[PDB]
Scaffold this motif. Structure first.
Motif, short mmCIF file in Angstrom:
data_model
loop_
_atom_site.label_atom_id
_atom_site.label_comp_id
_atom_site.label_asym_id
_atom_site.label_seq_id
_atom_site.Cartn_x
_atom_site.Cartn_y
_atom_site.Cartn_z
N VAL A 23 45.37 32.30 41.39
CA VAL A 23 45.72 33.64 41.73
C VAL A 23 45.91 33.78 43.26
N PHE A 160 39.46 36.97 36.95
CA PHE A 160 40.73 37.57 37.40
C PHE A 160 40.52 38.79 38.28
N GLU A 161 39.62 39.68 37.89
CA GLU A 161 39.29 40.84 38.72
C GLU A 161 38.78 40.38 40.11
N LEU A 164 41.74 38.98 42.14
CA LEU A 164 42.63 40.06 42.57
C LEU A 164 41.98 40.88 43.67
N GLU A 168 43.53 41.57 47.27
CA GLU A 168 43.64 42.92 47.84
C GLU A 168 43.02 42.98 49.24
N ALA A 176 48.46 42.52 45.59
CA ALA A 176 47.57 42.28 44.40
C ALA A 176 48.25 42.81 43.15
N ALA A 177 48.88 44.02 43.23
CA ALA A 177 49.62 44.53 42.05
C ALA A 177 50.82 43.71 41.62
N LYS A 180 49.43 40.61 39.98
CA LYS A 180 48.83 40.94 38.66
C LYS A 180 49.84 40.99 37.52
N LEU A 183 50.73 38.21 35.03
CA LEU A 183 49.61 37.51 34.38
C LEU A 183 49.37 38.00 32.97
N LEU A 185 47.57 40.65 32.03
CA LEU A 185 46.23 41.19 31.91
C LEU A 185 46.35 42.66 31.43
N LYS A 186 45.02 42.85 30.32
CA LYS A 186 44.53 44.24 29.86
C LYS A 186 44.03 43.94 28.47
#
Length: 186
Positions: A23, A160-161, A164, A168, A176-177, A180, A183, A185-186
């Protein structure tokens, strides 16, 4: 343009090593994967073997770094905790007001080296009592916790958080957005 040092020891959690490296490199950060024990391959906690970019001895001479990242894994964090080289790198990073990011049991190396006392931190749930021996930090159950220049996270599932958040902190919210979105992610 920004630079990250990832300190890789035997017994590190390979997900917590690889997710941040990947990342961070997606974010255009120049990342050095440095082997604590030298330049040889490192056997991680679930037996994935990662070849470091350099020894820590070598990489330490190529600073400074915008962030020093400590993966977790109980046995990797113990190796980090026992290392005088790590102690010096982290003390220098704090002295220069540089970010220090640590995940899962990785924050217990901060305790070992007397880094960032008085900060709000999180850890893996099972590392909480070790981290809190002496009351040197305030505990948080947030998945990622950032108290100024000390950035901590909980476990493989928060990697991942965690990564990121590092992106950031270094390169800003918009980068970072952008990183993201691909990837899934959610």
């Amino acid at each position: 343009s920004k630079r990250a040092l990832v300190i890789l020891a035997k017994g590190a959690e390979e997900m917590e090593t690889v997710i941040p490296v990947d990342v961070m490199r997606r974010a255009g950060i120049k990342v050095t994967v440095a082997g604590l024990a030298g330049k040889d391959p490192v056997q991680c906690s679930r037996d994935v073997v990662i070849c470091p970019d350099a020894s820590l001895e070598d990489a330490k001479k190529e600073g400074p770094y915008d962030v020093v990242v400590l993966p977790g894994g109980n046995l990797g964090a113990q190796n980090l905790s026992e290392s005088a080289a790590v102690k010096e790198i982290l003390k220098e990073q704090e002295n220069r007001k540089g970010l220090i990011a640590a995940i899962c049991a990785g924050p217990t190396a901060l305790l070992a080296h007397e880094i960032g006392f008085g900060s709000k931190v999180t850890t893996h749930p099972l590392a909480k009592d070790k981290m809190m021996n002496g009351g040197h930090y305030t505990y948080s159950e947030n998945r990622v916790e950032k108290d100024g220049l000390i950035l901590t996270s909980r476990g493989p599932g928060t990697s991942f958080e965690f990564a990121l958040a590092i992106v950031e902190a270094l390169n800003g919210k918009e980068v970072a957005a952008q990183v993201k979105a691909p990837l899934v992610l959610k």
